[PDB]
Amino acid sequence: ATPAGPPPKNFRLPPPKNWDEESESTIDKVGKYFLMTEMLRGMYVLLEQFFRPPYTIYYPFEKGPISPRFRGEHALRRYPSGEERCIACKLCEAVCPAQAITIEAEERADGSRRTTRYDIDMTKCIYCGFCQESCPVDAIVESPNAEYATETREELLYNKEKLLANGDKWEPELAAAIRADAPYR
């Protein structure tokens, strides 16, 4: 219970003090009992809080702080041209910790390598952000949007038509968060 070698210098406790060896005057000792002085001090600390500013935020008018690295709902982005950035490498499908991504790809009419299916089970996803660390083209991101509770969980099966619609909606904020964090990525 103590380490090997010599016992620690004064590890052993002093002998216990008898009641009449204690250094506390009866006046101090009896007063603290009947006046309940330590409980009075704690009640006074609550008066101090009473007259301090509160911590509360009025939501939804005032929001809490979120960093550029925040991990909210997924979005599929484009280039300035308008083409989808996604080229169907499937890296985000391989690294998914919860197997939430299902991708089916083929050759587009023009010969380009593009996805035909892009589904994200929002009820399987753990919001780790791994999908967006593995992208070679910044195609999949997680927007700062955390406010999308829905009614049915069928609404939480995002298909490629919803994830592109999300990127079109959120692009300025997505481009801004990428601009802030890119040096660190």
Binding site: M39, G42, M43, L46, L47, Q49, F50, R52, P53, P54, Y55, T56
Partner: protein, 378 residues
């Protein structure tokens, strides 16, 4: 008498119950707002402009809720039981005086009336806990009853010490007797014991661990019964407000405002019939108070039956509210006490001190020729 008694009976009863009920509703909002300032948050501030409707929506929600309590083998008990628990809560307000004699019932045995209505509280904690089906929780309703009866002895034995000083069980006489001095000053330790006894009597935290442990042993098969009922909540809040008014009646002034009109008499000595009202003081001058406009009006309003009654009730209200704060502050300041430890506090600390003071107080009143007369004076 100028008009019919039944009308007079009705107006005084409505004038006490409707303000008392509206007040019992705002103590619930107030206890959530006060605990939030001390906990650096906000209380209710959304149901109503300043959260002033929070009590209303809480009460109407419960009223509209389904109730699934057992109606079998006991139909009256499920329905007519808690209803009279709420009657036994409001029946104590009928002896509160809002000025000399200004009570629904001016009762000579007013104190023994509020000792009777209090011993009926034990039934509203015993019987409700009889509905819940869980072995350990039922024993927790007996332990809460045991706490109430023990802390009732604390209150009745310490009310005794006030009666010795006043000579009467009339709440009006008890307050009028404090015109000499508030009983907090000479019976300091009796007041503290009474306030501590009054928290334990209401089953309030930090003395609520017995009824607290029911929620922790409910299990996976049964549940409580105080569910959709606002009765045992209005019975609870109204007993806290009532224990604050009675605490003020006995130890603070009651409705006694420390009158500054005595101070101005002592200081002022340059009475002038021309209305100047010069004062013989160091910050004094020759005031220009308007005799035709102000002094004639001010003097009349001071002697009005409405104004003087108003100050007597604002005094009692300000004093009850200060004590309502001290109950809310106590709940937010301490952890809970175990049932055996509260029992030791009552039986081996508090009551020994009280019985020691029951000997000493009449002994001093005899030694200084200060036994009051027990005839109707004051």
């Amino acid at each position: 008498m100028s008009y019919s008694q039944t009308i007079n009976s009705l107006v005084e009863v409505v004038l006490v119950l409707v303000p008392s009920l509206v007040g019992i509703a705002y103590v619930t909002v107030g206890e959530r707002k006060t605990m939030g300032s001390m906990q650096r948050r906000l209380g209710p501030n959304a149901v109503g402009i300043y959260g002033l409707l929070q009590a209303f929506a809480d009460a109407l929600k419960l009223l509209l809720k389904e109730y699934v309590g057992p109606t079998q083998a006991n139909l009256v008990l499920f329905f007519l039981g808690p209803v009279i628990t709420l009657i036994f809560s409001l029946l104590g307000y009928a002896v509160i005086p809002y000025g000399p004699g200004l009570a629904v019932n001016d009762l000579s045995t007013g104190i023994l009336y509020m000792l009777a209505v209090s011993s009926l509280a034990t039934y509203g904690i015993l019987l409700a806990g009889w509905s819940a089906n869980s072995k350990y929780a039922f024993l927790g309703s007996l332990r809460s009853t045991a706490q109430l009866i023990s802390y009732e002895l604390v209150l009745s034995s310490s009310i005794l010490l006030v009666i010795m000083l006043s000579g009467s069980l009339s709440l009006t006489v008890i307050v009028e007797s404090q015109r000499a001095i508030w009983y907090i000053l000479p019976l300091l330790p009796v007041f503290i014991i009474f306030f501590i006894g009054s928290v334990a009597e209401t089953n309030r935290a930090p003395f609520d661990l017995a009824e607290a442990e029911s929620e922790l042993v409910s299990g996976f098969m049964t549940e409580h019964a105080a569910v959709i009922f606002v009765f045992f909540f209005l019975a609870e809040y109204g007993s806290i407000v009532l224990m604050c008014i009675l605490t003020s009646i006995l130890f603070l002034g009651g409705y006694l405002l420390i009158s500054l009109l005595d101070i101005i008499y002592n200081n002022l000595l340059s009475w002038i019939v021309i209305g100047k009202y010069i004062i013989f003081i160091f910050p004094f001058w020759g005031p220009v108070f308007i005799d035709l406009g102000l002094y004639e009006i001010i003097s009349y309003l001071y002697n009005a039956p409405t104004v003087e009654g108003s100050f007597y009730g604002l005094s009692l209200g300000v004093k009850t509210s200060i004590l309502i704060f001290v109950f809310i502050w106590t709940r937010a300041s301490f952890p809970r006490i175990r049932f055996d430890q509260l029992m030791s506090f009552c039986w081996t600390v508090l009551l020994p001190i009280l019985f020691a003071l029951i000997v000493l107080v009449p002994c001093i009143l005899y030694s200084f020729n200060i036994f009051p007369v027990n005839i109707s004076l004051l």
